Amino acid sequence: STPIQQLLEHFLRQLQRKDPHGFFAFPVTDAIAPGYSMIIKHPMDFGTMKDKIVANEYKSVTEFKADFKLMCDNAMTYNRPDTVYYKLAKKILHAGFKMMSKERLLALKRSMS
Numbered sequence: 649s650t651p652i653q654q655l656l657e658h659f660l661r662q663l664q665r666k667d668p669h670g671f672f673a674f675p676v677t678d679a680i681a682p683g684y685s686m687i688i689k690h691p692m693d694f695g696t697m698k699d700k701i702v703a704n705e706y707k708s709v710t711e712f713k714a715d716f717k718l719m720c721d722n723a724m725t726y727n728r729p730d731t732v733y734y735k736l737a738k739k740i741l742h743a744g745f746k747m748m749s750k751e752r753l754l755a756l757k758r759s760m761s
C-alpha cells in the first residue's frame with residue numbers, strides 16, 4: 649500500500665463504522681428499491697469506493713470526498729425522510745464532513761513539513 653491509499657482506507661473505515669449492517673456497502677438493486685436505476689443516474693456505494701482505492705483510481709482526497717457526497721445525495725433523493733436509509737445517509741454525511749473538514753485537511757498538510 650501507498651501513503652495516500654492508507655489515508656483513504658482510514659477515512660473509509662471510519663465512515664463504514666456508521667453503517668454496521670452494510671446498507672451502503674453494495675449497489676442498490678431495482679428489486680429492493682423500485683425504479684432506482686431510472687431515478688439515480690450515478691450510483692455509488694462503499695464497496696465501489698474500496699475498489700477504486702485498491703486500483704489507485706483516486707488522485708486526491710477531494711476526489712474521494714466527491715464519491716462520499718454522491719452516495720449520500722443519492723440516498724437523500726431516492727428515499728423519503730422518514731426512512732432508515734435517509735436518516736443513516738445524514739449520519740454518514742455529518743461524520744464525513746467533520747473528519748475531512750478543510751481545517752483538518754490543512755493541519756495534516758502541515759504535519760508533512
Ligand SMILES: COc1ccc(OC)c(-c2cc(C(C)=O)n3cccnc23)c1
Binds near residue numbers: 672675677733
Ligand atoms: C434491509 O436490507 C438491505 C440490504 C441491502 C441494501 O442495499 C445494498 C438495502 C438498502 C439500501 C438502500 C439505500 C442505500 O438507499 N435501500 C433503499 C431502499 C430499500 N433498501 C435499501 C437494504
